[PDB]
Amino acid sequence: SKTIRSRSIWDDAHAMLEKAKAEGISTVWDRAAEQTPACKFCELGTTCRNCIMGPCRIANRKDGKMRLGVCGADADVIVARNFGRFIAGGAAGHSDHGRDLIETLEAVAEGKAPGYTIRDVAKLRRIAAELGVADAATRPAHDVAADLVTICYNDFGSRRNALAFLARAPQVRRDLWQRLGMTPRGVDREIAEMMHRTHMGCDNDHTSLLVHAARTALADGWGGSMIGTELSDILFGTPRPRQSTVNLGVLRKDAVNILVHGHNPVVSEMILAATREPAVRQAAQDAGAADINVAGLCCTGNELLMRQGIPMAGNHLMTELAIVTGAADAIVADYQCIMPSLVQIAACYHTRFVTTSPKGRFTGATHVEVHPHNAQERCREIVMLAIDAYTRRDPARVDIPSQPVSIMSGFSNEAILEALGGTPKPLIDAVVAGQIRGFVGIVGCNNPKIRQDSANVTLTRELIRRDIMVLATGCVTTAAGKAGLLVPEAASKAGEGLAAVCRSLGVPPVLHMGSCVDNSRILQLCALLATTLGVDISDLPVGASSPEWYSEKAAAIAMYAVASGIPTHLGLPPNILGSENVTAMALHGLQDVVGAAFMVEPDPVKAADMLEAHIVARRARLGLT
Amino acid sequence: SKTIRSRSIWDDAHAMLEKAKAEGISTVWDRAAEQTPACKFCELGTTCRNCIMGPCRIANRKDGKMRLGVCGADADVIVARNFGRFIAGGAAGHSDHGRDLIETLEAVAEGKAPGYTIRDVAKLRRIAAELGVADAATRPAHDVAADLVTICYNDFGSRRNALAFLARAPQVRRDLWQRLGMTPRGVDREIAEMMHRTHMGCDNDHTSLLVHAARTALADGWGGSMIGTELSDILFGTPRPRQSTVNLGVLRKDAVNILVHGHNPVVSEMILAATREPAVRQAAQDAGAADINVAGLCCTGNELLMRQGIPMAGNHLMTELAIVTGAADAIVADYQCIMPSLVQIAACYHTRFVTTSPKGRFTGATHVEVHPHNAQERCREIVMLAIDAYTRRDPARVDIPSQPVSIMSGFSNEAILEALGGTPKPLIDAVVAGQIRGFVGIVGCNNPKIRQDSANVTLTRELIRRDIMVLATGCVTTAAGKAGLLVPEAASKAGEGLAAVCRSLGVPPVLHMGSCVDNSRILQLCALLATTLGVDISDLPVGASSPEWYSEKAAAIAMYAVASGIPTHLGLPPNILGSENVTAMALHGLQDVVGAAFMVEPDPVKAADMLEAHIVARRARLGLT
Ligand code: SF4
Ligand code: SF4
Ligand code: FES
């Protein structure tokens, strides 16, 4: 229908929205329509529930009433406090993700994690030496792991002056954070101090609350997310370039289709291993299946895509539609961005909805809790549930749409530097020469307010055309992939400068750099370039963008990009427009403080113009053409 | 007027409300009226702002729409997540409070905190030995302090299985927390994990979220609050019984009046020490003042009351009215419960409003930031500001309304056990004999929804009539004090059994046990009694009540009281009544799990009936009349 066509740009999504409509299944778009219009105070941020002297709303009335809360807080404080807690929720998701990776590596170091090993021992020694472990190159790998585990855990403590990975930032960027009071000291500490500041009668200055919001988000990018990325590479291998496929067509009628959903790869890496055991493959064969086919959703799909080339089934707004195919025999979920509607839609079919984390509980789900010491045993049990669910699949309701699209994935910073001969010198020369005018990381989510991936794909096309290389992470990866932009042949869709560089390296114009925690790879690349050139990150021709973000995590990623000197664009505004002072600080004031600011622009073509203008100005300050 | 009469039960509050009305000064009651009626969805908790697919509201509509959020969360999840963040904000207040006391003690142990010492070396050695410091009885005091600092910091890390002070709870209670997965592991970790669970698509089971809320609150009472209390006694002294006074009459017309506001006594102890320096006193008398007069507000006033006997000017809803007296020459604030309206009301007078913590910033306030390495220097500077403001006090607008009421304060557990001869046996004997039928800790705030202190005083009167001893902390202290119930002579207002025990020990029927962190003193006392009798805290004839609470911290205290087996009464409900399942869990379901539950009752007499009934049932299970 006209309505179905306006919800997404993808054929596989349209087909499933027709199927869901015919079957009477409501989707995220339907509930988004119901929640429209939204509460004007909640939209603007001028509402507060932090105590039961309230709840309060700030209104502009003729009689001057309701200008302040019961405690006396004005709109600036109330909007800033809400935005501060919004950021802290996002940093906390990445905080727990990074914490689980430390526990897993500690379990490996102690020999209490059957089925886990240190896949990349060379990276473990490099990271441990970088963070100061003594004799990281020669001591036994388990000892080196235990000492890195200790360094990581101490960043989750309250005794550090600065996070351990903060050393990667240029000295000028560290001096700036120090003068401003933004230096992140502890991953959990900043979140706790934010929750304390936003309590009634604590931090009642909107400038102070936003400064600590930056510090909280910086504890994510250079802490929770960076620890998660680096330890994931140690535990499961550093990504290298590889081919794979994307979209709902990666589901097979003839196979047990297991969709992994969530973020943490500690579970899905063992799910994948259980599917390869001979006895488990025998059960699938005894059930009439040709194979066991694992496919990814959202960031845990990105994780298996970067390290294993596991095909990605879809991104955020594709998750419900993947069950509508009738071929999803099991959804295995850990945490974050797993819509509870999946439980009800799975109940419409044979699909087993299996939760695996103590933090990711869903009423009505099948809970098989997974920890490092039992993951190999539990994941074997979970795949068996999927094989059993496969036997009850109704074939008359199976409709897997579309043909999978080829993609190239696995562009970690190690892979990037390897493709350049080992140093960033060829990369820097291309920028100086003007072949690659700059880099933009397009990151983030889908959002029902925006036609699915319309802004992600348009902005990607606009940027590579202007010789601006795109680094894609998160749910943008699937948008760039389904658009055919994640393959080296996509250089024909770039400008002459970017196309020529890409064709000499054999890489696509859009580099898939992983999941949402892997946005720390972009911080690492930016820090590595600024240090080499002897400048700040705010001098590099770079930018960040999330045209269709939804989550608190995307807010925290955008905030730590801005606080790190990266001009960051958002397609939709946060719930802050009720305060002009907070809005001006987010859009303009931060430029005077951290060298970068937020941009809110729903037109992806204007967004490309704005990101390009920042790049052009930074190129001028570097003395480039 | 009739309106002024309905806002408070006290004459000193009535006089300042009459004064503020003639001077055209809006108070917290005026703003509460503007915010009434409140938003229904915010009141019920059935609104969510956790992502920008929303904001969402859950409504009971005839057309069936808006039953779920955009992500699919129902009312049970949305209300439970809101309550979880509500609890986390309260636990974070106490967390940063305890973290600051660890920092002060560490600065003292390092010799980098002029003017601070270890005023109770005896308690330092006892506590450090209790938590496992080697040779704590004989090693140098600073060395023992450094080891206790390390132990305390580790509870602010992520490597422990249980907080250090949890060993105080009886084994049966620790085994229960373990089976339920409620054991608090890290003060900051539980807060960070709660913010992760409440992110979209993580924890979507209201039972699970509520269980982690109890864990998050238990990390407060047995962690942040208990560390804050014990380290404050080590740094500033263990409280002992002493006489003092309460209400706005503690302000002197002929003296420089410095009101200390907030929670942390690291500041106000050095403020008081600054007013006792001879050269500082000479400056006040050279300015025309008879002396410098320090008086307390809220919990930092409780701290100076417990350890120094400093008179208390008032509690929560008295803070604005204390400036309206015209005699408040300076307000010294740290953090929590400091209404931003105090800056505006101080601007109506000569009053200087001074902030001292980097976490408690107020636009327009005079910021003199205090840290252990410069507190002695800065606090002298703050008192000099107070003397200078005193020279500008307009005498025609001064109106100190009442005569202070005598109180007795300082009833730490150490003081209680000393009064009993060193063992709990005389107390246990009184309870077995029926002279003291039970204990109820009356804790918590004021709230404009309830006539100030009307429910606090009425419940306190009702409980001591029934031979139930009351333990008072927080802003209840000022209510019980102004009603004359904090002196030994108040035994005449108690039943025959409690009066006899009180006259025998020479103590009041209401024992002031300190600030809001000092509610950990109540947990310690219950744990000591349960351990001595070989039962659970849920077997003791005990109760908790906050008849006029408002803050997130009061909610957190109530949650860890219930989770520890103490039946807890709230005069007003949290924003949870939009979910019957969550309300039934808090009011009934928790009884089957932790042995206690919440009670919501705005009638203080019925609150006494419910509290007394729980105590009677527990006396029966112990085999008592
Ligand atoms: S903190 Fe202030 S603005 Fe927020 S609900 Fe409480 S009284 Fe209202
Ligand atoms: S988390 Fe769910 S209920 Fe809350 S605002 Fe987002 S979509 Fe709505
Ligand atoms: S729902 Fe209460 S203000 Fe938006």
Residue numbers in the entry:
A (entry chain B), B (entry chain A): 4 to 628
Task: Give excerpts from the publication.
In the present work, we determined two structures of as-isolated DvCODH using two independent protein batches and much to our surprise, we observe different conformations of the C-cluster in each structure. A 2.50 Å resolution structure of as-isolated DvCODH (determined using protein batch 1) displays the canonical [Ni-3Fe-4S]-Feu C-cluster; the [Ni-3Fe-5S]-Feu state that was observed in structures of Carboxydothermus hydrogenoformans CODH-II is no longer thought to be catalytically relevant. The ligation of the C-cluster is conserved in DvCODH with four cysteines ligating the cubane portion of the cluster (Cys519 is the Ni ligand); one histidine (His266) and one cysteine (Cys302) ligate Feu. One noteworthy difference with respect to other CODHs is the identity of the D-cluster, a solvent-exposed Fe-S cluster at the dimer interface that serves as an electron conduit to the surface of the protein. Instead of the expected [4Fe-4S] cluster, the electron density is consistent with a [2Fe-2S] cluster as is the placement of cysteine residues in the primary structure. CODH sequence alignments reveal that instead of a C-X7-C D-cluster binding motif, DvCODH, as well as several uncharacterized CODHs, have a C-X2-C motif. This shortened C-X2-C motif appears to constrain the geometry of the ligating cysteine residues such that coordination to a [4Fe-4S] cluster is not possible.
